[PDB]
Amino acid sequence: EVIAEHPVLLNRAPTLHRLGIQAFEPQLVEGKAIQLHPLVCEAFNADFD
Amino acid sequence: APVTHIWYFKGVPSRLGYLLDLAPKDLEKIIYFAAYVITSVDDEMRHNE
């Protein structure tokens, strides 16, 4: 109920440019990991390794 | 007994050095008691005698 339409900021260090930080809408997910959109990977330069 | 700040004396360029026209090598000799210095002379009385 509180999560609804409450944005959060995701950061992937190191942050080279401003796109290293982006806002998203949270979706409650099981497990301990984080689900990231595959298109934003180029911005964060985030490998899934 | 007073003491030099060491930020102005040791920091290059020496602030006390440029302020009193004193060389840093010589200024270090003064404040750390490695040699003497003439604080004042009597130019008139010396001239009479």
Binding site: - | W7, Y8, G11, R15
Partner: protein, 49 residues
Amino acid sequence: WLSAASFQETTRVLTDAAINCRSDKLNGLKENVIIGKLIPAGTGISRYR
């Protein structure tokens, strides 16, 4: 003067600023970041806010 102090050669920047009795108008954004103020840019401009 505190924007240069936070950048590089903090010791040299401080002694020079104190000797000149410098005054910082707190104009730039790096100053407002340190003091916890609203940076003068983006949504922080004197008009938008």
